[model samples]
Target chain A: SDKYYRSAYMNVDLNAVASNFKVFSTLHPNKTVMAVVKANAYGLGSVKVARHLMENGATFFAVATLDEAIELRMHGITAKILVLGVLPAKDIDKAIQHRVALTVPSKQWLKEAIKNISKKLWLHIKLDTGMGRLGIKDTKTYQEVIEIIQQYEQLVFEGVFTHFACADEPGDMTTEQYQRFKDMVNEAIKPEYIHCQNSAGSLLMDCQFCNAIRPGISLYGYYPSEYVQQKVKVHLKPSVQLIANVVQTKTLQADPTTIALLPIGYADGYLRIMQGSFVNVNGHQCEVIGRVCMDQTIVKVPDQVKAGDSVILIDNHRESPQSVEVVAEKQHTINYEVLCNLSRRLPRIYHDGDQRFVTNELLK
Target chain B: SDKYYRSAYMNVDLNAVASNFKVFSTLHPNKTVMAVVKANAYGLGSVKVARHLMENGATFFAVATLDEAIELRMHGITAKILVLGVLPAKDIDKAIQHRVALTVPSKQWLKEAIKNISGEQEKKLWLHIKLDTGMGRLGIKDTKTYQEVIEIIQQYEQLVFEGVFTHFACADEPGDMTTEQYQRFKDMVNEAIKPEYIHCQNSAGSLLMDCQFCNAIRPGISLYGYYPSEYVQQKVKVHLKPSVQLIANVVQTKTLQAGESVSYGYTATDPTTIALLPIGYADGYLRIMQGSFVNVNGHQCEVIGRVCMDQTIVKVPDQVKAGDSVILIDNHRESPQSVEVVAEKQHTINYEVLCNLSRRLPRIYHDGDQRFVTNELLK
Candidate 1:
């Protein structure tokens, strides 16, 4: 297999990622952009994406877990990393060893880390405005948390952030979340980096209250929601394209219809739900027939389509029907899930215009 | 994450896989057990599972791709490997070098491979002939194509035809499709000389239908603890223990007031106590599992809102704590998070539920007294 290839691979447009990154800079002008490369760069090879982002003037990065942060550190990423989720006290030493930042969700974790760490460790205080996942409960708890992190000389209060639950939709929730976030982490203390905007928030809302912006899916060429896509006119390129290889095009010789089988399937995160969706085969949109098996998918194709003919499972053009957003709409999910659900088994080929190379984890 | 860390992971009980292997052996004592470890053993580390299966008397291993076959060989697996899908004419040499069998689905591929390799090397390229019974997948469509493929293989010593097979489209269901497909297979292969191995029964077909002519039975999902279908479960008196447990540690517990959201959207109708799990859609719990149930502290907890990419909130009972172990999925048949129930809730077969489990979630194997872990993607 290493001698040749599966012929089913993904094309990650790094120039588009850079293009979207520049768009974020154009929008936020004075603010620092913190790249959220979590979930393995939203399942698009974190190390390569992070390296590319760093080369393109990204000084800060955010991942969801300690191991992911460590993975970045182990690679060439020397930039500051903030873990967006909670890491246990046991991994504090590992984070400390790697010099990666941890999201302090509570006063207890702050104190525990203070009791265990040396001087000058970064701590990003996570406040819960509306999303009831992880963070300080109330302003009172937030005040107590702010004091604990500042009280320790070992802690460097590098950033203060919160996640918006409904930033994309124009509603009262985003307003309330912004107000709550601005009120709690007010202008007085002025942590070096004050951020509350995710992709939707960065695209839709105002960022006067913050000095840093964290846009995740946007940097990868996906608008968080249709509402944001309709409101914002910042042109973003489709970052990833799923190209598939046809195993064979078979017919019964008596039957009128023909089927072209592909190796892209649910195991590769062309999920079973994508069976009814369409793929671009030989410039023709072909409907995927039958159930998507683990390593196989069959699509009703033209009889002329033969084996080894490439198909565009997801196109990198925003206007195309096979775009991740369009396919996400057809699959009843968001663009983020469509990109994030792709498995590591699919080799990701990073490209900058005509310059292309594979930065894959599975094949290597 | 390390082994001692009780963070989110899938516990693959290798003992359960062995037990299921014995169950298949007991069902058909005479037939050879061919392990179908394709799609990374249905997304459970294929190399590790294949090694374990080889130790448990599985000689022949069938994968769906050429890379999957080489991966096993790259590891410590020295058993016979068969690729169940088409390998391009170019990879015929790679298959020969690896000594892996390739599935010849059409006369064109056989003819291409033969034409490409004339008076080349002495190394034999093992192969299996495929017949299109009703699956409409990769296979010989008619008896004429089958005879031509056989003749093509026999003409060249390089392309060794080791077997002929067909896949049942509806073997797991309560229908006549299994018998009909079997009849088609018999009629098509009857005109030609039988190869060394002729298998038609998968996990369901072998259990429900009579294994009269098949010398080797390729059992895939059943070895990982599933009955293929409910009809097969009821008709066949075989029980396969579920080998996987999707476990996640509670990261935090929170309370949401009325009209306040938990995950995405306004999912909170009333005051709700929710526990956050590190496992989410990216880890393969998925958004469709929003209304599903997971076990928390021995009590059933409903997944409250939409499953996020890296986090999910489950409405927990009073006993749930920060570090309490949440069984997102378990082997217990009655458990709401069992693979079977998860499959039923998702409106897909059990095969997908297991296969869709993300590689980002590390697999911890329980092999008797020994325990080890593998993060294949991370590695």
Candidate 2:
């Protein structure tokens, strides 16, 4: 409704995100659904996405870092905010002040965290069954971490979780990972919440012993992997669409070799690799020509198209030919990277049910 | 300083930037050196970079869009600013009010701009005629528009033809194409009514070609301490310093067995000592940088696994430990982990490599003995 400029825009349908969350919750009934709103909700404006999820029935939210959790808290989000990544031991006091849950990666982290803090705060123990990025791997470290938490009355053991390395692959690794996590939970400690499955783990794997599900990419209508799509049956709707206006149109030669310039470029997180890709204009595909400039891109379009016409870069329709998944495949990356790498420089226009508003405008 | 939380930080040396600008200005004694501060000064913080350049004797600045020009003006950059892209005709009044020069691409643009205005502005609006010689992105295609603008300028007292310019497509190719561009630009514009400033050389063009006839040079990447290429560097003498250093600390460390994997998708290979860094693709270190190396206490460690959104796994040496500082972009120009080298490995240019760095990372600026934080996160 505001005067929009910059020519490039990303439309976020909050209702679609809510629908996706509801569908995921229904599929795994009676379990707590924790929405992962880290990395700005995969660069889809995390605050709005998390707010939408909370309004739609998500009881908990997780982020990747302490700063992310603090951002959520600053934005007036009072849900159970968990930091899924390691935080420096020194910042534990601030985390306590904000009521954020910290992820303990190892016994050393626990020892360090206990030394730096004397106040009560919620904590999640990350068990490194296989992902190998973070968490306690061996039984000795896991037992040591549990003992340290028992000694420190300030630490509240709220949850225990692990990340999936290949939950999307066609294999039995999910079962092995779940069994490993299950063995650790049974042998050592029991927390109020136990989550092992990400989007792929929740949809494709049996996921025997978990009370909560942290579905990330699937909540935004993207399959975690190709193998998961074949194994799982659930309808997902894309909530984000990248749209741009044709700033200029000109013909190079007599045969009407036309090129139209769009204001979106790599700086907008459109990336230079998208130079050869195609965008839908007037229900017709137009090939992007030559190199993508910093603030502009030239697309070879039909002569009928004129300046000020709308062009869809990332069509949100589930069945559209130029979906986010297709663009990710063309760029030789995953949908997570493609969506998360989208520049925050573009204004995010949100549509909430029947009401629409512009949440962020770069020019302002 | 505000309490820093994000382990990632970009250190920008303002003294080095001023030195780079002075070197380029000395190289072209008579020509006006316009600093290209668009795209956040190629992701090095434009307003600060422009202010440093202005202090070092830069008289003009150029940006890619009208919004960028307005941003610089809002930051109290009184230097003349030029908008190098096509702006909507409806926004011409805003540009005129800001006294920012607008590039005239086509005759239709000029006609529409003239129609949008009713009376004389408080200040004369400077117009730059864009000649499309080789870079077929945006420019005038015929001589009629050039002459029409010249004739129209005579009738309209508020409009002034301040400059004429052309963008080079293949400065590295240096063949019939660039020469043809030069000839076309020289022959197309009438000499009797020559504009005040004529620029035909970008950073590469100025170093590789004979652009002595032009009165201004637009030095972009070279100002950031990167030669366009080795082939073009034979003639260039500026020893520009790479002013930015991306610094991060190791958050966690572990020793992996030969068969065990690290990070997502099991893409990490070989048994080695892995150190997890707090910066990832969300910080502008793309996933394609999985195989590149980072500098830890002068030791180059291989990035062993697939990059995550907020973390990257690097195989560190036995001497490297948690909390040790790691240099993602080494400041040394010859280092293999330099911004230019890393950009080449990532299949992108240095411009995009620096610009793609997310604003979430804190920027700590230093000048001689003065140091302060222009932290984006805190701001």
Candidate 3:
């Protein structure tokens, strides 16, 4: 009956996180801050991250799916949840009922909006100048969609925005996409707020940051691209770190080839690409040898180590062991893959200063 | 409210599955059918697969973690569940109380089990020996550790001997590593399982007509691998088709030059074609076809640039338009990256890469019944 509450918990330093948020909010004083938390806060537990932001004076949150918005509601998060991603065209009514601002991409989306159009429900028109995934493909669809929105009496045009596909890549495409978006927004409908800056877009080459910068990766810490990190210098620190208890440890009769086996593996979602790495143990660093296994991976523990020892995956206090990002890079993957694939099976410990939010509400 | 079931579902044909089970089951008629269903039946949903197999007369099922066993219990699956991998010594009580069997690896596990032993609860241990046949995973730690299990268990006689099993190091192992595993497993546990079958095999070598059969045969891949090609078959007919569907329709239409950048990183090089696919990182098509290619209307479409969260672009057929289904892994394209292709792409294997696909993608069932819907086969 007792709830232990961790199959894997991500620890977020509130001060460090608040510091990262203040970096964005103060840097861009002209625009509002719409904290982007799509994909479970970029695979960093949505509720906890949103709460941390809300506590630091964040009023708007953007998620990718209706399920995520509904999840916020379930956790009693009452911030303005913006559905930034496409809404499957069939789930508009649910979005409206939940008070989630729908991002209109196409006339097909507009028709669905008009069907469930209500005065209380708000909508944001998404323009696709070049991103080419979801949104009005051209100036024609953009104009036609804006006219329909203007014609609708019940619906409120909450915002007008477009996503920059190449913003993360320090190139002319960022400026081109941004300029094209500006021209369309100027010619089309004007709303209360305008946003196009994602984590990368916010840190544009020029002082071309959007009105409301949606910082998904930045708020959680880490620049979306090295280009943004080097150019804009929006210095933000990563908030989440994964730690696992060293269940048991053993020592090898030291030899040229002999290595201590510290058990943890690929089946635990720790991909095999993390073949050669190091972890800290009681302030002493040890090498991880051999390929990670499905259930158990081996690490070369210090000869002096005992059976019951704690190993640090990544700790800021001790020259931070191989970061989760490095593991992804080694695997020819990205930070998002490492973040999401850290299965719900490992116990996660979320810490803020001396306080913690540990819940064994049951994982599904 | 209704469950937002995915529109694209994995069609698991029960008859096809049953036929596959029959083939593997008949491989060793004397051995037990311990269906390996870890990782949500290899990400095909455990409850459905377990139920389907049980209806098809499969008596035993194995999972990698304790949570998977708990999942089956919640779904009313009464068959015995064995924890195949490893467990933290901390969760022994919970494991026993749940009636799910635990794999005994070390002498310490024996002591832990003995400490929790009470005359009150009649929980039987359905243990599987994970022999180190050189997979380098969990097993009785070393040879001494393997012998110590029997030595310690003599005092705690309540432990039921379900079976002693060793996984093939490389059923795909190039040299004698596969034979080495069989030989090592045989030499170690020869006398351990008296009156019990010494199961030392898997999908690749164990199912081979030339390989030896002990007590149990574990066919994790062949249950689904043979559907595309029965190349491994020397004479015996063993067929199992992939039950996964990674079909995504084109969401956007754009003709890109060989030099135009497609996705992030601006990595899509010049002089090649590109078609944007709706499937992306979130859908489990993790990266742009950086390593693997997709099938677009019967043509090999190279994925361009970086894979965004919800969309990827590939060079499709000249006439391929929006809403055309692309196969990430199909029989034509292998519907899944040939477990080997995915392994090569991820530098892992057919096993891990296919299992890494997100559970968000739904599974749909399609019975191989031509008499029922012959007309829609063209669709």
Candidate 4:
């Protein structure tokens, strides 16, 4: 239908990303921060975000797919990139070709990668520490993988690690998973760099089960779990913020007869479930009315707001956690969806205080 | 960690697409067909689908943006392309350069486009009349827009009046919105192109709406096998088949006892057996499908846990083995997740779900390839 404008760009906060890294580093001083910049840096242009994190002293970066790793290499970021997800048998050659690190969770992939190894590859042996996602699940495969790696000369055994399925919670789940991870490591051949900590595990656990830790969401200023968010007093800066300009504004009729429209919707990656959602504009909260359209949304503005007025979809200007928490809570959504779903098309305007920085801000 | 493979490829069926065009055309033989191939041809790979439609008699095509038009042109499609969504004021040059048609719903964009028209390029404007048919999107307010266009053309001397276009506000709704839309559109532009075929019905209206169809019908989701129009009978050639396949590897497995828990927040999972799928919301499987089921070992398996960014968990049947290929969406009816079903689960229509399929997944065109084997592809 001929009633909307598209081409909305997502605004990224580079300084916020760097500052978040700084905050995460401060939060976990003993362990090195391996920032997870995968899923195209959580849909915020992976290479650019990775480069920003790299400049801010992030030594290790993780991606979900081989294409992401290949994309990083194409961009000239030689930082140690690790694939935290499954790598297909066909893509092992590219992984070896690009010199990207691989996470071997199953003995089958380990055998295949070694047999068809084209180049010396950096490999991370992932143990299943109770998270049924990836990594070696049992002691037999874990031991077999280590022995195979020793027998094989082509691949470099980099590190041994596992993901915590229940780390975000404060229950005995994390401890159980952590114990399982340690027990597997004790049973298997230990590599030089031992690792087992996401954002939640690092914040909740004092004893470092591994030598290095990969903090994903928390590095971008979010706790993996509510328990971590409440009990952990660790301060971190939010890296990504989604902001949109009100393309059109309107008043409302009381009986669901009328409402104002905002120029962002589902096609813009802001789903319609966000209808009846609230946003803070000019320090006041406004209720969203009607279903959000393909390219725009409706807000019940009190006849005061005008077109071109900026609405803070994700407020980062305030240091108070309450404001962020309020916006995240109203949508019945988490901060992750709010941040990740901020489509790549939105121009990410990175700002710290009053200083707004564009891309290549003093990078020449 | 080692039990599964996680790559999924979407196979677009050109035969199904062509048969859809034939069926829709037969329904309204008098009305010209404008196949809406926007959003990457509704995520079925626009270039190929467009070729399939044109070969089977589709002269008009509609897209959401200018980039989509350029894609069709690059693939050598010469049909009349209409940009229905929105075009920016600044990039009007590229639109004219590609000979792509423009839909001006507001006075601002119309004036800007006419003002920016250079004298040397005496290009004919392929225009569509957009009225506020109750959708409250973009469109000219009234006859004032027609007067404005006429006045602007006197000065510019380079615009043409092709036809008037208005979208059916509620063709899918069981209401008078579609009636109001047709009545208003007829009152506005029927005189200008009286006896001139005006268009109001979309795929949803093409069958039931006998009154709205004047000249053309834009079949979008219906072309991809979705029944957009309720009244229209789905006519498929005996061979028209679905061309999408979804396969995933089981990354790991956990046998939860009667008291144990599952994924994030433990919101909606069970305690049977959870096999973590290396596919998730980011892959367009979406979080809304938290409690749905997938097909593994030709049996219905329940999906547990909140959908994560790149992974989800589905509790498999006891007999199902690890490392087995789980078919989430495919052509087979027995163990299949139709595009329509997934859309319903995600609380969206099929169009959005199909289009939002991230470019991360690989696309394998099957029907076109099969043509080479049998030598039955359209010439």
Which TM-score value belongs to model 3?
Answer: 0.84
Over the stretch B29-92, how does candidate 3's per-residue lDDT look in tens digits? 7777677777666655577778878988888777767777876876788987777755565666
Q: What is the TM-score of chain B alone in each candidate?
A: 0.93, 0.93, 0.79, 0.82
* Number of clashing residue pairs, candidate 2: 0
lDDT for B270 (candidate 1): 73
What value does DockQ give for candidate 3?
Answer: 0.28
lDDT (tens digit, per residue) of candidate 4 on A89-133: 666777787888888868877776665654678889877665455
lDDT of 3 at B293: 79
Global lDDT for candidate 3? Answer: 0.63
Position B170, candidate 2: lDDT: 75
Error of 2 at A220 (Å): 1.7
lDDT of each: 0.82, 0.81, 0.63, 0.66
Q: Write the per-residue lDDT of candidate 2 for residues A1-364, one digit (tens) a residue.
A: 4434366779988888898898878877878888988888887888778777778787899888777777777777889989887888878898999898989888888787776775568988898887675788877777777777787677888888888788878777667878888888888778899998788888876564898899988888888877788777787888899998887787877556889989888887888888789899999999998888788889999989988899999999756767888888777788888887676567788888678777442344
| TM-score against native, each model | 0.94, 0.93, 0.84, 0.84
Q: How good is chain A of candidate 4, measured by TM-score?
A: 0.87
Q: How high is the lDDT of residue A63 in model 4?
A: 82
Model 1, chain B only, scores a TM-score of 0.93
Q: What is the DockQ of each candidate?
A: 0.55, 0.49, 0.28, 0.25
